[PDB]
Amino acid sequence: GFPELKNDTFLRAAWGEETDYTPVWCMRQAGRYLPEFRETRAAQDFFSTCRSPEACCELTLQPLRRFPLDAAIIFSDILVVPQALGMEVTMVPGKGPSFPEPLREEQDLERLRDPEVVASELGYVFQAITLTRQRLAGRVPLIGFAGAPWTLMTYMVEGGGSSTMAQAKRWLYQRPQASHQLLRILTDALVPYLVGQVVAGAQALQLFESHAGHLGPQLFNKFALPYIRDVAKQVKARLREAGLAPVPMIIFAKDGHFALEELAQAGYEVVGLDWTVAPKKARECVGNTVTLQGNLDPCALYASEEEIGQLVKQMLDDFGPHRYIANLGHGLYPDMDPEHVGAFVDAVHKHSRLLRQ
Amino acid sequence: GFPELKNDTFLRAAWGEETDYTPVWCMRQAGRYLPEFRETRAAQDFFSTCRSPEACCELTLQPLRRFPLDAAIIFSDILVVPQALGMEVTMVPGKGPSFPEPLREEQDLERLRDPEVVASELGYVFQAITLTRQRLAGRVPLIGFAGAPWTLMTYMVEGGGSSTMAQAKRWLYQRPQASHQLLRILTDALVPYLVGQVVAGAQALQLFESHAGHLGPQLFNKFALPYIRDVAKQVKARLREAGLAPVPMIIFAKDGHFALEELAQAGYEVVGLDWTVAPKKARECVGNTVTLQGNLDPCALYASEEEIGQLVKQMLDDFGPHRYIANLGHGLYPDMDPEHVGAFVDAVHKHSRLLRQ
């Protein structure tokens, strides 16, 4: 029902196939570093923007008009899921996300919706995905996404960002049964949501475990890993059963150096890396089956266009040509210069071709 | 001129000697989790507390009255150094540290003092150290400390904590010459300060590189490592030349998994670990010469006293008995229960003895 994909380099790399160059995209490529993003966002409030399919489609396309990126990622936010579960959220400009009434005791779980109804609440995201897939007209693949269960749990309990996740970790140690209950509710909401994203037109999916780094290995293996595994297994299952093709799935565990070995066995085609893990060491950890994605320090884009090209050259030398999709090690920051993002994109394309012939 | 040390287990472990049990201390053992700490702090404002030798001595001793910890660490704060360099600081209760006028351009370096005069500005810390060494009367060794150059740089440029260190990293990429100038000024202030701490009575020194994790390996090796190395080399040199004994030096690089190999060659007797690095993997990285310190997830202390003992048992099994000092993976949090800190201390003592005979 959709236009035929023209440039599929990103998908071929994700599945582990040889490609003629290394495909590249950037986390937060639709973001505040773009003046045009600020302009179209100035029209609605944040979660209102997320609910207008035309606005989401527009913000998704904007970076592709500037740069020859090898994938688009739908504009949305990981917090749409806990919102759909019945939590009230804000993105008051300059402050970041906030739940003024976070989950703090086991009894608070009673306020959440049955996770089986969440996908219906997120119909607007599916509308945006279908629209954007049609408007892209096959230029590049479209990535859908969501937050991983533990990371969503941290926002719901902490009520926003935290440097320690002390309240969410206190749940894991003091309320392990209620923690597993919440993580299961999240898993059960995420599966039908991700499946719906693919039904609507997503050609790949990325799960953001942005708060992995706070756990360390014992708690990660108990509370984050099982659910990351269950998401991949159940999404693939549901898609096959609906007669659709599974899409490549990416797991990005920020600050998750300690989990890479387990992550490479978790049922994802691609493991995304932050900038703190040396590419050669990541390759040793994950082995030679999975694709790696990343991992340039996003702050490297503050350097000159010349310096960016040399950092990219180095990065590409370390990863080598096979089983690799270039990206930053985290999302672009709001004060970054679009021309330097352009420099990063062009450097990956130029140097990866030089590396092959 | 000081009382003879009675319990030197911590020092013997630090130098790599076999001991009859594993010594233990906790970062922030003088901290807000103690009601008595809040009480004596309620008397002065924060940096005024830091300037009263009797108040510092009291806060240092308080945890030792509760628990048989194997070392004391002087109460102070890493921010006394940039304050002594001429920056104005606040610790407005509930808000954390703040410099209302952070360093933002190269010209701002002109406001700092010559680093050679910093030690004289920090005479109050040396007074506190001498007092505390006398009052401890040889019970356990006294640890002195300071922030590492990069970590101090982040506070001076950011003006407080940050989840990204984007402004400080922008300096490293866009102003590398001015960054090296600032890091050298910091190094040159830290050396005479640390030497003065030992002259005043410190029996060990810990350098806190709390913001290591933001760098990743390339920037860490360029901007943090050289100065961490220079601190150790110059402190040891100055002490030998004054006819004093060097003390064991600990480098703690929080979120510094990627730097452990380099850190084990940096001139420190002890490498301190956060809770995200598996003890066996840390041992592989650092080799068999240095002592490891750490690394229990501080949030594990939210668990039951029984659970804490089993986590400690596991941790001790992984580190093994040799070249190991037990501690948390970061400082105690203000909402922690002193009885659970007591449980941690007792578990290390009990299980490490069981592990030996």
Question: What CATH number has the domain bearing residue B215?
Answer: 3.20.20.210
> B266 to each of A304, B4, B270, B290, B330, how far by Cα in Å?
31, 30, 10, 10, 21
| Helical pair A225-241 and A149-158, crossing angle rounded to 10 deg | 120
With 0-12 / 13-18 / 19 or more C-beta atoms within 10 angstroms meaning exposed / middle / buried, residue B102 is: middle
Q: How far apart, in whole angstroms, are the C-alpha atoms of residue B19 and residue B13?
A: 7
Cβ contacts of residue A210 below 8 Å, gap of 6+? A78, A147, A148, A151, A252, A254
Position A84, amino acid: A
CB A19 within 8 A of CB A80: no
- Tokens 């970790």 belong to A169
**Cis check: omega of the bond before B7, within 30 degrees of 0:** no
A30 contacts A62 by C-beta, under 8 angstroms: yes
How far apart CA B228 and CA B222 sit, in angstroms, is 11
Give, to the nearest 10 degrees, the angle between helix A53-66 and helix A338-356. Answer: 60
Do B162 and B154 meet the contact criterion of CB atoms below 8 Å apart?
A: yes
Strands A204-209 vs A142-147: parallel, antiparallel or unpaired: parallel
Q: Report the DSSP beta bridge partners of residue A209.
A: A253
| Side-chain half-sphere exposure of A337, counting CA atoms within 13 A | 13
Question: In terms of DSSP H, where are the helices of A72-175?
Answer: 80-84, 118-121, 123-136, 149-158, 166-174
Helix ranges, A94-224 (H)? 118-121, 123-136, 149-158, 166-174, 176-199, 217-219
Q: What is the tally of structural domains in chain A?
A: 1
Cβ neighbours of residue B10 under 8 Å, at least 6 residues apart?
B23, B25, B70, B71, B140, B141, B204, B325
Strand order in the sheet with A249-253: A72-73, A142-147, A204-209, A249-253, A270-272, A291-296, A324-328
Bridge partners (DSSP) listed for residue B72: B142
- C-beta separation of A295 from A240 below 8 A: no
Rounded to whole angstroms, how far apart are CA atoms B248 and B250?
Answer: 7
Helix and strand totals (H; E) in chain A: 16, 7
User: Rounded to whole angstroms, how far apart are CA atoms A35 and B114?
Assistant: 43
Residue whose tokens read 């592990």: B355
Distance CA A250, CA A271 (A): 6
Q: Is A303 exposed, middle or buried (0-12, 13-18, 19+ CB in 10 A)?
A: buried
Chain B interface with A: residues with Cβ < 8 Å = 161, 163-164, 166, 169-170, 172-174, 213, 215-219, 255, 257-258, 274-278, 281, 297, 299-300, 302-303, 307, 311, 314, 329, 333, 335
Asked whether the bond before A327 is cis by omega within 30 degrees of 0, the reply is: no
> What stretch of H or E contains B206?
strand B204-209
Give A296's strand partners: A328
B255/A276 touch (CB, cutoff 8 Å), yes or no: yes
Vertex B135: Cα angle to B133 and B140 (nearest 5): 60
Rounded CA gap, A115 and A99, in Å?
19
Asked if B277's CB is within 8 angstroms of A258's CB, the reply is yes
d(CA A220, CA A16): 27
Contact A172, A223 (CB under 8 A): yes
Residue B285 and residue B261 in contact, taking contact as beta carbons nearer than 8 Å: yes
Q: What is the DSSP string of B40-106?
A: HHTTS-HHHHHT-HHHHHHHHHHHHHHS--S-EE----TTHHHHHTT---B--TTT--B-SS---SG
What six digits make up the tokens of B186?
Answer: 């910091």
**What's the CA gap between B124 and B51, in Å, rounded?**
6
Q: Catalytic residue positions of A? A: 28, 32, 41, 77, 155
Q: What is the DSSP string of A31-56?
A: STTSHHHHHHHTTS-HHHHHT-HHHH
H or E stretch at B328: strand B324-328
Residue A84 annotated as part of some ligand binding site: no
Q: Which of A32, A172, A302, A332 to mutate to test the interface with B (most CBs of B within 10 A)?
A: A302
Which residue matches tokens 């490297």?
A300
Nearest C-alpha neighbor of B62 from the set B10, B137, B134, B136 = B136
Among candidates A163, A216, A300 on the partner chain, residue whose Cβ is nearest the Cβ of B276: A216
- What residues does B296 pair with on adjacent strands? B328
Contact assessment for residue B232 and residue B275, using Cβ atoms and an 8 Å cutoff: no
Q: How far apart are the first and last CA of chain A?
A: 38
Calpha distance A301→A127 (Å, rounded): 34
Q: What is the DSSP letter of A114?
A: P
CA dihedral in degrees (B162, B166, A335, A62; nearest 10)?
-90
- The residue in chain B having the minimum alpha-carbon distance to the alpha carbon of residue A308 is B173
Q: Judge whether A288 and A320 are in contact, CB under 8 Å.
A: no
Q: Which chain A residues contact residue B297 at CB under 8 A? A: 169, 216, 218-219
Q: What is the DSSP letter of A24?
A: B
Instruction: Name the residue among B327, B273, B279, B318 with its Cα closest to residue B300.
Output: B327
Cβ within 8 Å of residue A355, ≥6 positions away: A22, A316, A317, A320, A321
Which residue range is the domain that position B294 belongs to?
A: 1-357
Query: What does the alpha-carbon distance between residue A275 and residue B115 come to, in Å, rounded to a whole number?
Result: 33
Collapse the DSSP code of A207 into the 3-class scheme (helix H, G, I; strand E, B; otherwise coil) and give the result: strand
Report d(CA A196, CA B263) in Å as an integer.
48
Name the token pair of A159: 């009520």
**Rounded distance, CA A133 to CA A142, Å?**
7
Using DSSP's 3-state secondary structure scheme, residue A65 falls into helix
Can you spell out the DSSP letters for B123-173?
HHHHHHHHHHHHHHTTSS-EEEEEE-HHHHHHHHHHSS--SS-HHHHHHHH
SS3 call for A166: helix
d(CA A161, CA B128): 37
CA distances (Å), A56 to each of A98, A177, A331, in order? Answer: 21, 38, 18
Start-to-end Cα distance in chain B: 38
Written as six digits, the tokens of B171 are 């300096």
CA angle B178–B182–B183, rounded 5-degree value? 115
CB B60 within 8 A of CB B29: no
Query: How was it solved?
Result: X-ray
Closest CA to A276 of B123, B243, B216: B216
Strands B270-272 and B324-328 come out as unpaired
Which chain A residues contact residue B277 at CB under 8 A? 216, 258
Tally the C-alpha atoms within 13 A of residue B269's C-alpha that lie toward its C-beta. 19
B173 is in an annotated binding site: no
- Mutual angle of helices A123-136 and A176-199, in 10-degree steps: 40
Would residue B283 show up in a list of annotated catalytic residues for this protein? Answer: no
**Nearest in space to A190 (alpha carbons), one of A172, A212, A205:** A205
Amino acid at B327: N
**The residue type at A155:** Y
Q: Chain centroid to CA B3: how far?
A: 24
